[PDB]
C-alpha cells in the first residue's frame, strides 16, 4: 500500500487505551524538536489537517539535559495550567539550544517573566499541585509507550509516527508528508 507499517509509522506492540488521540512528545534539549517547531510548524501543519473532533496533545519529558530537563518539564506542567505555551515555546528553544541563557530553573522563569507572566503568578503554578498532576501525566504518558526518543508523535495509542521514512529533501514536502501520515492514522 502507499502507506506502510514500518515505513511512514510503526505500530505498538503494546496499545495504549485511553491516550489522548493525537499526542507529541519533545525537549527543549532535543535539536530536531528545535527544527519541528521553529522551523517546520509540524504541530501546526498537522492540527490544520485534522477533522473536527480531535484534540492535539503536547508533552515535555525528562531525559534529556538532567536536572533542567526535569525543571523543563515542571514549567511546560506551568505553561499548560496558564495557557502560555504559545508565548514562552520559542523563547525557551532559543534559550536552551541558541543563545544557551537558560542554565538554572531562575533563567527558565525569567522566560515566563518577560513575556509577561508575573512572578507571583509563575511561582504559585509552578509550586500548584495542579502542576504536579499536569507533570505526573508527562512522565505518565511517555512512561506507558517506553519512549526513549524525541521528537516523537503517537496517533490513538496505537501509531508512532516514523519520520526517518519520509524524503528530506524538501522541507515543505517532509511537512505534509508528515500531516497527511497523521491524517491517515487518524481515520485508520
Known amino acids: 500500500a502507499q502507506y506502510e507499517d514500518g515505513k511512514?509509522?510503526?505500530?505498538?506492540?503494546?496499545?495504549?487505551?485511553?491516550?489522548?488521540?493525537?499526542?507529541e512528545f519533545f525537549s527543549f534539549f532535543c535539536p530536531h524538536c528545535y527544527q519541528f517547531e521553529e522551523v517546520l510548524h509540524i504541530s501546526d501543519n498537522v492540527k490544520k489537517?485534522?477533522?473536527?473532533?480531535?484534540?492535539?496533545?503536547?508533552?515535555?519529558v525528562n531525559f534529556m539535559g538532567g536536572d533542567l530537563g526535569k525543571d523543563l518539564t515542571q514549567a511546560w506542567a506551568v505553561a499548560m495550567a496558564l495557557g502560555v505555551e504559545d508565548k514562552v515555546t520559542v523563547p525557551l528553544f532559543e534559550g536552551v539550544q541558541k543563545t544557551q541563557t537558560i542554565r538554572s530553573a531562575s533563567d527558565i522563569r525569567d522566560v515566563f517573566i518577560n513575556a509577561g507572566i508575573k512572578g507571583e503568578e509563575y511561582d504559585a503554578a509552578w509550586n500548584s499541585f495542579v502542576v504536579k498532576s499536569l507533570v505526573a501525566q508527562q512522565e505518565k504518558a511517555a512512561a506507558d509507550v517506553q519512549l526513549?526518543?524525541?521528537?516523537?508523535?503517537?496517533?490513538?495509542?496505537?501509531?508512532?509516527?516514523?519520520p526517518q521514512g519520509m524524503d528530506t529533501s524538501n522541507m515543505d514536502v517532509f511537512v505534509q508528508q508528515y500531516a497527511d501520515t497523521v491524517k491517515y492514522l487518524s481515520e485508520k
Do not use: C, I, S, W
Open 8 to 23: 511512514q509509522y510503526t505500530t505498538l506492540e503494546k496499545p495504549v487505551a485511553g491516550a489522548p488521540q493525537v499526542l
Open 49 to 60: 489537517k485534522l477533522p473536527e473532533g480531535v484534540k492535539m496533545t503536547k508533552y515535555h
Open 148 to 162: 526513549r526518543g524525541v521528537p516523537a508523535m503517537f496517533v490513538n495509542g496505537k501509531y508512532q509516527l516514523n
